[PDB]
PDB file of C-alpha atoms in Angstrom:
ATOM      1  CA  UNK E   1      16.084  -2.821  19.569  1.00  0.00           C
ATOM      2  CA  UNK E   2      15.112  -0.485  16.374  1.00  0.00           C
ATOM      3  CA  UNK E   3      14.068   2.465  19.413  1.00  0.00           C
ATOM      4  CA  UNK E   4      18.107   2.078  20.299  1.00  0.00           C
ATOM      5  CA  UNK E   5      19.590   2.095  17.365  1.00  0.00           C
ATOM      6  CA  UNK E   6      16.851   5.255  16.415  1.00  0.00           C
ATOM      7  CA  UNK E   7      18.061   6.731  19.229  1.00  0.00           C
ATOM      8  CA  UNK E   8      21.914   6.203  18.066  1.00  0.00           C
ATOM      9  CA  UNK E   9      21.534   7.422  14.849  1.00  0.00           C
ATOM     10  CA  UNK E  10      19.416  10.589  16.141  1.00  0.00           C
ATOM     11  CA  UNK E  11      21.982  11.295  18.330  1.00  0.00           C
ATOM     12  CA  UNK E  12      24.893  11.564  15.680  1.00  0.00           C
ATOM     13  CA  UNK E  13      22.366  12.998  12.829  1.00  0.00           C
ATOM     14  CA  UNK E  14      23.460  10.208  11.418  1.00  0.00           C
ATOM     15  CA  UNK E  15      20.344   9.452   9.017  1.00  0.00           C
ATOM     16  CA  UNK E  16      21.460  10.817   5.854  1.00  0.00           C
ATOM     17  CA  UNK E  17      24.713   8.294   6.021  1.00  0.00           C
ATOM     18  CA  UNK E  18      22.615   5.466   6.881  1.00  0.00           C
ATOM     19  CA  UNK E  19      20.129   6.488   4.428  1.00  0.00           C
ATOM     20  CA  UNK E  20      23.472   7.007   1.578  1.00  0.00           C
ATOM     21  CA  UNK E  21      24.303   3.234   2.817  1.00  0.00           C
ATOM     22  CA  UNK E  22      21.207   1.628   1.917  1.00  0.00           C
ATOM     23  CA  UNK E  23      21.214   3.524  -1.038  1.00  0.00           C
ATOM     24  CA  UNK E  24      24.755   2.307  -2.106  1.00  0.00           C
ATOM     25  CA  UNK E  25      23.954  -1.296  -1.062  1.00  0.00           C
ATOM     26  CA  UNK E  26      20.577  -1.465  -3.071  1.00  0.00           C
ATOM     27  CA  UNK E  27      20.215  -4.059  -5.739  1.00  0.00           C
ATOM     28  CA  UNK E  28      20.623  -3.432  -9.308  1.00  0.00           C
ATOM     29  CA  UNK E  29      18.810  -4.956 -11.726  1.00  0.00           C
ATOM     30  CA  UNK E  30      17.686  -4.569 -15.548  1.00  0.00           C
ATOM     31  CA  UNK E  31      14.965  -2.372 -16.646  1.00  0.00           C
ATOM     32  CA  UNK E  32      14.845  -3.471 -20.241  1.00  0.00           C
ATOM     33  CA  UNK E  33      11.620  -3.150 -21.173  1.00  0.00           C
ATOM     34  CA  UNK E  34      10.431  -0.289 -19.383  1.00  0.00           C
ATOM     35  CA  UNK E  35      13.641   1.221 -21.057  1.00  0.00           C
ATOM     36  CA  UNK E  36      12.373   0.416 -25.045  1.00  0.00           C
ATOM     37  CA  UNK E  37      11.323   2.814 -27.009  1.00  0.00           C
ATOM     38  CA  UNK E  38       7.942   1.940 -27.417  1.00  0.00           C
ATOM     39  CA  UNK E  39       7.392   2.738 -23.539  1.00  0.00           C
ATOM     40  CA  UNK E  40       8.602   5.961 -23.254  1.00  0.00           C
ATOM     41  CA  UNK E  41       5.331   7.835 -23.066  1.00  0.00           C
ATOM     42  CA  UNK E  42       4.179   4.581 -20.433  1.00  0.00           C
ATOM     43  CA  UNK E  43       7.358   5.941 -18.249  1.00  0.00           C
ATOM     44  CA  UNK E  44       6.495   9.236 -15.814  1.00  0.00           C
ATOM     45  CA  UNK E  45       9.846   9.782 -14.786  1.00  0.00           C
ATOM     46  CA  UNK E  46      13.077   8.751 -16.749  1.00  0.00           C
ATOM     47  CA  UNK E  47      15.276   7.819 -13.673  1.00  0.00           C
ATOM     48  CA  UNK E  48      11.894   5.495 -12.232  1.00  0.00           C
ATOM     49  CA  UNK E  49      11.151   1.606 -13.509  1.00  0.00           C
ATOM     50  CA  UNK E  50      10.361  -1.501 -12.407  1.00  0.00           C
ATOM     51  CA  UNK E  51      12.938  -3.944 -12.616  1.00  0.00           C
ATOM     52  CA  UNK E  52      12.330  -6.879 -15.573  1.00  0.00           C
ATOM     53  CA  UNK E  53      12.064  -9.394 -13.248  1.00  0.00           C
ATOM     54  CA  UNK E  54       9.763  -8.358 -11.047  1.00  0.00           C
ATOM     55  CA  UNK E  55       7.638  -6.050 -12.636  1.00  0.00           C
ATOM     56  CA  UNK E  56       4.180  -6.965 -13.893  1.00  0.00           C
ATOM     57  CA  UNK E  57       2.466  -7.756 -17.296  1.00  0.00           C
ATOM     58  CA  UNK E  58      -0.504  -6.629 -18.682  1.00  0.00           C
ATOM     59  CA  UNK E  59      -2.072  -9.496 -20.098  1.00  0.00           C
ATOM     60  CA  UNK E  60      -2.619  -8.334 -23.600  1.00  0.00           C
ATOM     61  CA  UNK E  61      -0.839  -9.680 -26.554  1.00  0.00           C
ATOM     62  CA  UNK E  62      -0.274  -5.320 -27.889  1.00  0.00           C
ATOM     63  CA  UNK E  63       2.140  -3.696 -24.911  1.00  0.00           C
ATOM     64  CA  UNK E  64       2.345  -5.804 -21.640  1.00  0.00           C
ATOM     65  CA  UNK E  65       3.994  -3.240 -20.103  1.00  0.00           C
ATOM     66  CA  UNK E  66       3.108  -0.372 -17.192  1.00  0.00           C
ATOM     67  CA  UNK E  67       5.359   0.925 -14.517  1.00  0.00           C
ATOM     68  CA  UNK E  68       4.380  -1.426 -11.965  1.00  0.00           C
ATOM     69  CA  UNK E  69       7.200  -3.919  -9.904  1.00  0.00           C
ATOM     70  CA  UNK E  70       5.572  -6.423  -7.544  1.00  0.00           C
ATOM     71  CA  UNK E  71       6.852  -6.500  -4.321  1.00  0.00           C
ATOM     72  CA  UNK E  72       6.816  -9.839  -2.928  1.00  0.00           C
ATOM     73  CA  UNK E  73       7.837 -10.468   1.169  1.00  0.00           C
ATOM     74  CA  UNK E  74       8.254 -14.037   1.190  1.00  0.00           C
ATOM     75  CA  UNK E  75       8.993 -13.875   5.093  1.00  0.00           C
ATOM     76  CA  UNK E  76       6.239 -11.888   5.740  1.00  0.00           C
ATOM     77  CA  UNK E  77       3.676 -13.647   3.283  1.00  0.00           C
ATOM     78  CA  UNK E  78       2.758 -10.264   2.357  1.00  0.00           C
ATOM     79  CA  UNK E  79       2.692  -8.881  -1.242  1.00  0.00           C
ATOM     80  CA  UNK E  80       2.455  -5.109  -2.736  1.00  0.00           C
ATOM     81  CA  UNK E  81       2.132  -3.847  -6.020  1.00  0.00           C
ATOM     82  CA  UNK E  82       4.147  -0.135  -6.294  1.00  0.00           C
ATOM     83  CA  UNK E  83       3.214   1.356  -9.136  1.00  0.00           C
ATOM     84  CA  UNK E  84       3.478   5.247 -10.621  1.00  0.00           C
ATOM     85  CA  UNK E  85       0.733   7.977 -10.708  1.00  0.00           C
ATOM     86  CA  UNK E  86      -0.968   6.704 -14.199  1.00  0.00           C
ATOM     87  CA  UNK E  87      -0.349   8.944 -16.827  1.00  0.00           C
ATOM     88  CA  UNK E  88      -3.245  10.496 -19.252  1.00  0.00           C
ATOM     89  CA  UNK E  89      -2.619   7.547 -21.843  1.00  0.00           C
ATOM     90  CA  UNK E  90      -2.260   4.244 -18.758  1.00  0.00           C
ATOM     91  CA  UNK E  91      -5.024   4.712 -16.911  1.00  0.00           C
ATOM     92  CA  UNK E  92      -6.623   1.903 -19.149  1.00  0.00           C
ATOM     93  CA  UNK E  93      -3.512   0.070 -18.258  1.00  0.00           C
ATOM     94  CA  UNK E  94      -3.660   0.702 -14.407  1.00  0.00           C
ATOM     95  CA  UNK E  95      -7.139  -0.791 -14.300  1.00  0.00           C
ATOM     96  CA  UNK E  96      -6.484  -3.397 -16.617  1.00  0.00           C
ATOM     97  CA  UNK E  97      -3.694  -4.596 -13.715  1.00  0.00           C
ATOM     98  CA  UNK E  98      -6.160  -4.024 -10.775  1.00  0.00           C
ATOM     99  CA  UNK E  99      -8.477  -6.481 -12.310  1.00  0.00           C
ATOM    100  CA  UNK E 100      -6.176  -8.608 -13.583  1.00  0.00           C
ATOM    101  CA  UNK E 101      -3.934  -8.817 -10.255  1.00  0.00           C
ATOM    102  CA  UNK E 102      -7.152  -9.089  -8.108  1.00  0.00           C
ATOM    103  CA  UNK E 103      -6.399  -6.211  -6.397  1.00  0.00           C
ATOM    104  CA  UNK E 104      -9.153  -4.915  -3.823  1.00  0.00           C
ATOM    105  CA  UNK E 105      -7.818  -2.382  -2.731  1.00  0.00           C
ATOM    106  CA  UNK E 106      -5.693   0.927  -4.136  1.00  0.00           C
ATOM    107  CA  UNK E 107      -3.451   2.978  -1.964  1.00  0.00           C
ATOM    108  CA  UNK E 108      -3.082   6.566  -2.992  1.00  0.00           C
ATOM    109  CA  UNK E 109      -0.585   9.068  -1.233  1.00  0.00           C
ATOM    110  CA  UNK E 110      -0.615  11.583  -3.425  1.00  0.00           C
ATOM    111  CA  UNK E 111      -2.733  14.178  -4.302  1.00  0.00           C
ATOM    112  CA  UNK E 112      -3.403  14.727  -8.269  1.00  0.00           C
ATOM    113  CA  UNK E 113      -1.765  18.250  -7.929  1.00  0.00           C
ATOM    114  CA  UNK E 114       0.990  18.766  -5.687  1.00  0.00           C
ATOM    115  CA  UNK E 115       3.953  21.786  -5.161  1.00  0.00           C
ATOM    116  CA  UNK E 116       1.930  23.838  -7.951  1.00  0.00           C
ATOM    117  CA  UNK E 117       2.533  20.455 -10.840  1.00  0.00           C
ATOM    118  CA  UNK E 118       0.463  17.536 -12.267  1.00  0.00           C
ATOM    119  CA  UNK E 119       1.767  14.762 -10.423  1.00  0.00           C
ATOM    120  CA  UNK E 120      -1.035  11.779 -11.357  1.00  0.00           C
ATOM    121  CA  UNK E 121      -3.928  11.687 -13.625  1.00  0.00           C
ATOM    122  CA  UNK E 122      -7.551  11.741 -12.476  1.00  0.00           C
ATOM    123  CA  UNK E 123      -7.567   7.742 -13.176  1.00  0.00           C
ATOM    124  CA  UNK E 124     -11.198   7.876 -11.097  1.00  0.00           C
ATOM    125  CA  UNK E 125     -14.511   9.130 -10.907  1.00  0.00           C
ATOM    126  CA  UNK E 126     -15.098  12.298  -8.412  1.00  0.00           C
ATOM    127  CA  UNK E 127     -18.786  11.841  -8.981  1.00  0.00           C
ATOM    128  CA  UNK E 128     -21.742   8.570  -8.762  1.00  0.00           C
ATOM    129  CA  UNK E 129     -23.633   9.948 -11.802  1.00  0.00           C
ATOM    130  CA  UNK E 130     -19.882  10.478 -14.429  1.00  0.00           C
ATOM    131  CA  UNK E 131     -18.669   6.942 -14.368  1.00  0.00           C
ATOM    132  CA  UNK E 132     -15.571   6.362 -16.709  1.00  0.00           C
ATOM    133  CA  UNK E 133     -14.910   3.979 -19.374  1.00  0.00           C
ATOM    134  CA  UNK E 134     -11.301   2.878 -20.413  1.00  0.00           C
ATOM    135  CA  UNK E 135     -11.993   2.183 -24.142  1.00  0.00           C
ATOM    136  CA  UNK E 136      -8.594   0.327 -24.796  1.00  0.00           C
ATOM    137  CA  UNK E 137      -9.064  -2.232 -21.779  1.00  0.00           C
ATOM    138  CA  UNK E 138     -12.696  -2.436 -22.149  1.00  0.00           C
ATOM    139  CA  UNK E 139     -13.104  -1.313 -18.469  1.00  0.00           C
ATOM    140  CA  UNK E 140     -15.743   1.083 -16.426  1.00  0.00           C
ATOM    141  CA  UNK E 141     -15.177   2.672 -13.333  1.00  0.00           C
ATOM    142  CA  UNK E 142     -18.097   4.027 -11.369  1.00  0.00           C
ATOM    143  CA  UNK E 143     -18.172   5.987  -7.715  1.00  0.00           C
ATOM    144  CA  UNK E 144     -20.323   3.935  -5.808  1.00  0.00           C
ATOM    145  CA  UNK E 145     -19.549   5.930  -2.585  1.00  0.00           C
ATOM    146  CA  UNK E 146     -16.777   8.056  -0.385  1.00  0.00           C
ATOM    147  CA  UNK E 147     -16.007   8.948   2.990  1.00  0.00           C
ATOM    148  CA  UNK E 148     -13.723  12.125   3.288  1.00  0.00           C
ATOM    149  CA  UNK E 149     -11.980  12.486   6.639  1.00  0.00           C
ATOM    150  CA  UNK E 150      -9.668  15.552   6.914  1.00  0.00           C
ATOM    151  CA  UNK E 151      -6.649  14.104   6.080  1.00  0.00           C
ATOM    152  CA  UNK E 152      -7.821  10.950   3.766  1.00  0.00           C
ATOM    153  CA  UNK E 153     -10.796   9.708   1.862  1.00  0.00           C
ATOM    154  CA  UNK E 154     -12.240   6.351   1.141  1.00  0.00           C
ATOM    155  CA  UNK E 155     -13.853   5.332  -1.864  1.00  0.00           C
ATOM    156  CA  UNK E 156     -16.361   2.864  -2.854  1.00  0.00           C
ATOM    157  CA  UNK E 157     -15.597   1.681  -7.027  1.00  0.00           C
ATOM    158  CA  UNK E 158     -17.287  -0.247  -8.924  1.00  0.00           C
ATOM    159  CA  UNK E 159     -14.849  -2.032 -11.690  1.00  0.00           C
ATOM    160  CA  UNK E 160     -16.575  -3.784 -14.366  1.00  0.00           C
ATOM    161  CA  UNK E 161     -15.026  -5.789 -17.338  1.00  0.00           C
ATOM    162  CA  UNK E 162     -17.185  -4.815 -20.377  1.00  0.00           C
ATOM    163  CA  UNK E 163     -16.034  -8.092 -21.942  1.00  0.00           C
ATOM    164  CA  UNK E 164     -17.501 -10.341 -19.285  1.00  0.00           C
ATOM    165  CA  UNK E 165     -19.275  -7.893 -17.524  1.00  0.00           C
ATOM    166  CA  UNK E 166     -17.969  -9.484 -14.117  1.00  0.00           C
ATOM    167  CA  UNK E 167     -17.605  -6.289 -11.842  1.00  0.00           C
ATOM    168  CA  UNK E 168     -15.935  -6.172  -8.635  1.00  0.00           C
ATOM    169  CA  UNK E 169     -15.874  -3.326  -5.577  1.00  0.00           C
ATOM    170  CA  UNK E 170     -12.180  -1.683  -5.295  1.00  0.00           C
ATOM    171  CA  UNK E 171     -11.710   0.132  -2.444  1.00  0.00           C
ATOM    172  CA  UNK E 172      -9.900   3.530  -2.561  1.00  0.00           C
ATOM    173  CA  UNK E 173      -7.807   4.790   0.005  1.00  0.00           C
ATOM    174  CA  UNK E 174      -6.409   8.445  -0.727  1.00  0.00           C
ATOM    175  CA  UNK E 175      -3.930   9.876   2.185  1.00  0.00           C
ATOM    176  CA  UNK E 176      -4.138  13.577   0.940  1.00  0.00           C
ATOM    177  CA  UNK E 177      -1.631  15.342   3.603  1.00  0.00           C
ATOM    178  CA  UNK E 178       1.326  13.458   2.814  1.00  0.00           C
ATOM    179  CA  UNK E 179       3.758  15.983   0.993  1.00  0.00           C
ATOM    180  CA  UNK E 180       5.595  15.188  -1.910  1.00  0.00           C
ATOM    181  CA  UNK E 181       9.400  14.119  -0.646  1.00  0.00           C
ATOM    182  CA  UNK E 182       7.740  14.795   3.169  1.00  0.00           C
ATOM    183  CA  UNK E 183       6.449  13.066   5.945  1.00  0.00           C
ATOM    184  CA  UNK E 184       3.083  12.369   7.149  1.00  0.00           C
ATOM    185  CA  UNK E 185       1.835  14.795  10.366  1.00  0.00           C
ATOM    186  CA  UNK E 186       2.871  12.288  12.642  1.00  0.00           C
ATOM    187  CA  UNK E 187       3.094   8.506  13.622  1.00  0.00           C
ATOM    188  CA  UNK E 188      -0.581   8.539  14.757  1.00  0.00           C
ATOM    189  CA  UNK E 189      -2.462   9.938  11.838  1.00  0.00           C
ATOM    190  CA  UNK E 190      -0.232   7.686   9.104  1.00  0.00           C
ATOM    191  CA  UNK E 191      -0.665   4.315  11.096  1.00  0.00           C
ATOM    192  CA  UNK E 192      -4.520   5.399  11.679  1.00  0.00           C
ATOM    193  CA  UNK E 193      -5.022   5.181   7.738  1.00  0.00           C
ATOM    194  CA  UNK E 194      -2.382   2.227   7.543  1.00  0.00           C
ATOM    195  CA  UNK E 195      -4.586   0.527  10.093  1.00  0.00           C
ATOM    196  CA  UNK E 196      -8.137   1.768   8.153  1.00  0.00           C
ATOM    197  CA  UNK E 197      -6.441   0.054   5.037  1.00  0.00           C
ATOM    198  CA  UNK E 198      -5.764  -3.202   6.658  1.00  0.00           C
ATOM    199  CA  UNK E 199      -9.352  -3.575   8.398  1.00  0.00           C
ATOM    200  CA  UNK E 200     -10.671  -3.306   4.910  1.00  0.00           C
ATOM    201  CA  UNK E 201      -9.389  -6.751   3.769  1.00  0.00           C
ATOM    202  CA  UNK E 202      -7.411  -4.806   1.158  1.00  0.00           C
ATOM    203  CA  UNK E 203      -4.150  -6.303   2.335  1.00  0.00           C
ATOM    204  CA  UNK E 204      -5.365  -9.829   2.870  1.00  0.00           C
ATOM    205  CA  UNK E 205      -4.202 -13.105   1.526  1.00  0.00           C
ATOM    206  CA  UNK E 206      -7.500 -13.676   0.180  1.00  0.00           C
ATOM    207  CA  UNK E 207      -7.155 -10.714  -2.429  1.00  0.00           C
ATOM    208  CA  UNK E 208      -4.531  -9.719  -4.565  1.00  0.00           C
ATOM    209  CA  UNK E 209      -1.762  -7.928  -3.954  1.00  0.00           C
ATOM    210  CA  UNK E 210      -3.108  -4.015  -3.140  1.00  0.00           C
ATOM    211  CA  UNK E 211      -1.951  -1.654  -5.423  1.00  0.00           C
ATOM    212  CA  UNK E 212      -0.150   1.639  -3.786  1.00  0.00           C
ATOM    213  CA  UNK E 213       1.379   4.270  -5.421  1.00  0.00           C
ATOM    214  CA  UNK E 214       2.311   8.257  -5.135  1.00  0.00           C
ATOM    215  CA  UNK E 215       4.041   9.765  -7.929  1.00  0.00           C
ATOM    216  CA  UNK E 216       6.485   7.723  -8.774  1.00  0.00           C
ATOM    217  CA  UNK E 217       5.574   5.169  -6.725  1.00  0.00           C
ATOM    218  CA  UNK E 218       9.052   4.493  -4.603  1.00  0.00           C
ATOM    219  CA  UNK E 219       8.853   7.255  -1.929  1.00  0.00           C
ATOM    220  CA  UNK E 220       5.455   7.596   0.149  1.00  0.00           C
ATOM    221  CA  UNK E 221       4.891   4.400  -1.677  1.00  0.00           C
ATOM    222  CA  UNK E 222       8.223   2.647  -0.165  1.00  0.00           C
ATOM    223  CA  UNK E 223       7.408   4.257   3.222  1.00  0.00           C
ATOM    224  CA  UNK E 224       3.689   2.890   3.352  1.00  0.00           C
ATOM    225  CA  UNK E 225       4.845  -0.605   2.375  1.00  0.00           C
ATOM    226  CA  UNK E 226       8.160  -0.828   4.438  1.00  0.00           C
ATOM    227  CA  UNK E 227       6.304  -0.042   7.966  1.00  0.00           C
ATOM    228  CA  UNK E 228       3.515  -2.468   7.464  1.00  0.00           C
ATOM    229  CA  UNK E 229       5.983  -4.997   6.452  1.00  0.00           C
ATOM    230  CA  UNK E 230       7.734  -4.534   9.740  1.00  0.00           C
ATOM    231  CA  UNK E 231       4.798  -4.219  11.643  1.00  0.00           C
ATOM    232  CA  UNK E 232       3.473  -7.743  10.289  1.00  0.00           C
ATOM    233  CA  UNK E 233       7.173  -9.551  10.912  1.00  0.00           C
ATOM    234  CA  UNK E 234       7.324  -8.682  14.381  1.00  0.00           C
ATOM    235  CA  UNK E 235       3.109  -9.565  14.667  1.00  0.00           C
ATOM    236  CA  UNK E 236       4.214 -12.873  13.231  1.00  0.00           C
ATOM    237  CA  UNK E 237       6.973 -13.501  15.864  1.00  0.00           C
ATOM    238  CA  UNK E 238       5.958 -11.185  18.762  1.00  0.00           C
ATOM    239  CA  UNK E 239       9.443 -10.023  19.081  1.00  0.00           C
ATOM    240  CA  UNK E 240      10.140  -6.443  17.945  1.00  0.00           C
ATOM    241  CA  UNK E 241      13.531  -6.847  18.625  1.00  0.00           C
ATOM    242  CA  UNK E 242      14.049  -9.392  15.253  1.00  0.00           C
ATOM    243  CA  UNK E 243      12.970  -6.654  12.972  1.00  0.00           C
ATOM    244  CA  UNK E 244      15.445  -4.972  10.882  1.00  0.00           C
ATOM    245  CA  UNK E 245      14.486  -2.216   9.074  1.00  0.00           C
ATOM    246  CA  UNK E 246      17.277  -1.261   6.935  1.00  0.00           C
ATOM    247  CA  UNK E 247      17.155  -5.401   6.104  1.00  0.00           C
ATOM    248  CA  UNK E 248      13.551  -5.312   4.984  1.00  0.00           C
ATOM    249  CA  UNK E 249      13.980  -1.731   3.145  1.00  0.00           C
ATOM    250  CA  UNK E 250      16.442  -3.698   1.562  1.00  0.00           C
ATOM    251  CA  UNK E 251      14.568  -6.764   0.809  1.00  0.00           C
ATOM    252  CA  UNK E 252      12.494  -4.624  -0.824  1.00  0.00           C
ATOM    253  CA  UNK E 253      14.547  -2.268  -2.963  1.00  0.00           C
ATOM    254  CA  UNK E 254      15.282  -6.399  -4.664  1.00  0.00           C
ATOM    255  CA  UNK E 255      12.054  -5.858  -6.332  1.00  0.00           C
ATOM    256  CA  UNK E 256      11.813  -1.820  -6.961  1.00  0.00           C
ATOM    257  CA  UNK E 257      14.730   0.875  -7.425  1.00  0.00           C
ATOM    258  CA  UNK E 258      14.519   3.850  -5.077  1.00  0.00           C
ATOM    259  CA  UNK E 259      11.980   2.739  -2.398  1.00  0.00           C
ATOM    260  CA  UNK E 260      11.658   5.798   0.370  1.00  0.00           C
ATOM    261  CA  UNK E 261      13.538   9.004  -1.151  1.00  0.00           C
ATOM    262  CA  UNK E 262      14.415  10.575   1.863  1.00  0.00           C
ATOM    263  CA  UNK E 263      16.746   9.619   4.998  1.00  0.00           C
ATOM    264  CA  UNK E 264      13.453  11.387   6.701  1.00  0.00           C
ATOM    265  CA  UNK E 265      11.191   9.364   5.498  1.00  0.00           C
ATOM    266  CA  UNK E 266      13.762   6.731   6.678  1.00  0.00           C
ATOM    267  CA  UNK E 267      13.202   8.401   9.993  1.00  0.00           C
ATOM    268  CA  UNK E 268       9.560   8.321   9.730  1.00  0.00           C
ATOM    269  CA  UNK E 269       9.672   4.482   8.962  1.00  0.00           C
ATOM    270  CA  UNK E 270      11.344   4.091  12.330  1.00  0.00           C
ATOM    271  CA  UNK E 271       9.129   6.059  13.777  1.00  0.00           C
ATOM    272  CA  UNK E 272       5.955   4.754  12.514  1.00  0.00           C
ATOM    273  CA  UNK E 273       7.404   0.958  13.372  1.00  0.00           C
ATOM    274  CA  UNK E 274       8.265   1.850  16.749  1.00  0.00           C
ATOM    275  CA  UNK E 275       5.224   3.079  17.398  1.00  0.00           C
ATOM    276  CA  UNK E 276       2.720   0.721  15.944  1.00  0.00           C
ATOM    277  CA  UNK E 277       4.804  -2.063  18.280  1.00  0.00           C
ATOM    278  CA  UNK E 278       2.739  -0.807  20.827  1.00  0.00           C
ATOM    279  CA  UNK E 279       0.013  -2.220  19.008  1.00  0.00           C
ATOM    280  CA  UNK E 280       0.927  -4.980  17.797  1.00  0.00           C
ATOM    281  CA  UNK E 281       2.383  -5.916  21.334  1.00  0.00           C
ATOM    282  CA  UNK E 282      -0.714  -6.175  23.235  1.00  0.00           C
ATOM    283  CA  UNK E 283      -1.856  -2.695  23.550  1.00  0.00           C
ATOM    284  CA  UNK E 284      -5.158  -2.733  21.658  1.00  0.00           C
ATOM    285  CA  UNK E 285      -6.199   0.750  22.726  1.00  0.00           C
ATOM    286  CA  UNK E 286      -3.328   2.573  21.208  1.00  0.00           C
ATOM    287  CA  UNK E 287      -5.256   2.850  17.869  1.00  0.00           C
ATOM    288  CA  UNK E 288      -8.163   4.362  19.500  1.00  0.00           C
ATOM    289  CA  UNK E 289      -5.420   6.911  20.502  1.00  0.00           C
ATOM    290  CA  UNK E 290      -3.871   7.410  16.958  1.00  0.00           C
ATOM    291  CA  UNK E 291      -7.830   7.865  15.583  1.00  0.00           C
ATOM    292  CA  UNK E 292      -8.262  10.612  18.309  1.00  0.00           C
ATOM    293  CA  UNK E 293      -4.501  12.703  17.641  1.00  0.00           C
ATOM    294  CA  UNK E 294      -5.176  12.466  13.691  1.00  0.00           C
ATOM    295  CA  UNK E 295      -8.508  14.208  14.410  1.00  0.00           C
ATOM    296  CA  UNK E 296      -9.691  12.999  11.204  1.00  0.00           C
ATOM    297  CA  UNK E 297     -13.504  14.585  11.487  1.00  0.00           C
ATOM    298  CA  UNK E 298     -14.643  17.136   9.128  1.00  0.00           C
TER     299      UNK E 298
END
C-alpha cells in the first residue's frame, strides 16, 4: 500500500532520501540538440532540456527544435507533452506544436510572474477583442471565452492556421495558486482542477497529447502528470495496491530530466494519489467534496 509506505517514510522524515534516490537512479540521456548553439536563446534554463530521443520536432525545415520532451506511458496508454514557459521569441513555436501535436488542451501551473521574476511569456490573449498573431508560424490566437475560479481559470482559444485557415478550440487550464518549488493548498483543490482537466476531453485518446508546463516544465509539471498517471493505472486495474509511485516517477524521468523538484512535491504526489483512490475506488461523491474544500467561487 502507497498510504503505508507514506506513512513509513513520514515517520522517519525520510522524503528527502527517497526523493535523493530517485534522483540518483534517474535516466540519463543526450540533450544534443537542445544543447547547439543555435538553441540557446530557445533554452529558458541552462540545466533544463528535453532529452533527443524523446523530445518533439517542430515540423519546419528552419529550427525543429523547442523545449518540449513527450512523455509517453505505454502502461497507462496515456501521453503528456512537458514543455517550458515559452520564451518572448517561441511562442510561435509553442503554438506551432499545439497544432501540430493535436493538442486540445494546455495545462498551465504557473503564473506569468512569480517570487517578484518573469517566469513565462504572455503566449495568450487576456482579451476577445486583441487576438494575437504568431508571424513566423503563421498562427492566430483569439480569446473566445474564460471562466476564473479563485484558484484557476479556464479558457476558451481559438487557434487558427493562417495557411489553411483550419482553426481549432484549445482549451486553457491555468492553476494560479501553485507556488513556484511549492505545493498546491491541498489534495482537494489540485485533484478538483486535475479532475476539471480530464472532464474536458483534454486528456483523451481521441486528442493529442495535452500540453502542460510551469516554468521549466519538470516540477508542478512532473507533479500534475505523475498523479494522474497513477490515478489512471490503478483505474485501469482497480487495485491501488499495484501502483508504484517512485516506479512511474521513474518511468517518467526516461523521457524528461528533473520531473518534480522537490521531495515535497514528492510528498504531495503521494498525497494527491492516495487521495484521489477514493475516487477512483467507487466513491463518486468524493469530488463533490474536493469542489466544496477548494472553494473555488469568486
Amino acid at each position: 500500500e502507497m498510504e503505508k509506505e507514506f506513512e513509513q517514510i513520514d515517520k522517519s522524515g525520510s522524503w528527502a532520501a527517497i526523493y535523493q534516490d530517485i534522483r540518483h537512479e534517474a535516466s540519463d540521456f543526450p540533450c544534443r540538440v537542445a544543447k547547439l548553439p543555435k538553441n540557446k536563446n530557445r533554452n529558458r534554463y541552462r540545466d533544463v532540456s528535453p532529452f533527443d530521443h524523446s523530445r518533439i520536432k517542430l515540423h519546419q525545415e528552419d529550427n525543429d527544435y523547442i523545449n518540449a520532451s513527450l512523455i509517453k506511458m505505454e502502461e497507462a496508454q496515456r501521453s503528456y507533452i512537458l514543455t517550458q514557459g515559452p520564451l518572448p521569441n517561441t511562442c510561435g513555436h509553442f503554438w506551432e506544436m499545439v497544432w501540430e501535436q493535436k493538442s486540445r488542451g494546455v495545462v498551465m501551473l504557473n503564473r506569468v510572474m512569480e517570487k517578484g521574476s518573469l517566469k513565462c511569456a504572455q503566449y495568450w490573449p487576456q482579451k476577445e477583442e486583441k487576438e494575437m498573431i504568431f508571424e513566423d508560424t503563421n498562427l492566430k490566437l483569439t480569446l473566445i471565452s474564460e471562466d476564473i475560479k479563485s484558484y484557476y481559470t479556464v479558457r476558451q482559444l481559438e487557434l487558427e492556421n493562417l495557411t489553411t485557415q483550419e482553426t481549432r478550440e484549445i482549451l486553457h487550464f491555468h492553476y494560479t495558486t501553485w507556488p513556484d518549488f511549492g505545493v498546491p493548498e491541498s489534495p482537494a483543490s489540485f485533484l478538483n482542477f486535475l479532475f476539471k482537466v480530464r472532464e474536458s476531453g483534454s486528456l483523451s485518446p481521441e486528442h493529442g497529447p495535452v500540453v502542460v508546463h510551469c516554468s521549466a516544465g519538470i516540477g508542478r509539471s512532473g507533479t500534475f502528470c505523475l498523479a494522474d498517471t497513477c490515478l489512471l493505472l490503478m483505474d485501469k486495474r482497480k487495485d491501488p495496491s499495484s501502483v508504484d509511485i517512485k516506479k512511474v516517477l521513474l518511468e517518467m524521468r526516461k523521457f524528461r530530466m528533473g520531473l518534480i523538484q522537490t521531495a515535497d512535491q514528492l510528498r504531495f504526489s503521494y498525497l494527491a494519489v492516495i487521495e484521489g483512490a477514493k475516487f477512483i475506488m467507487g466513491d463518486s461523491s468524493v469530488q463533490d467534496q474536493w469542489k466544496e474544500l477548494s472553494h473555488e467561487d469568486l
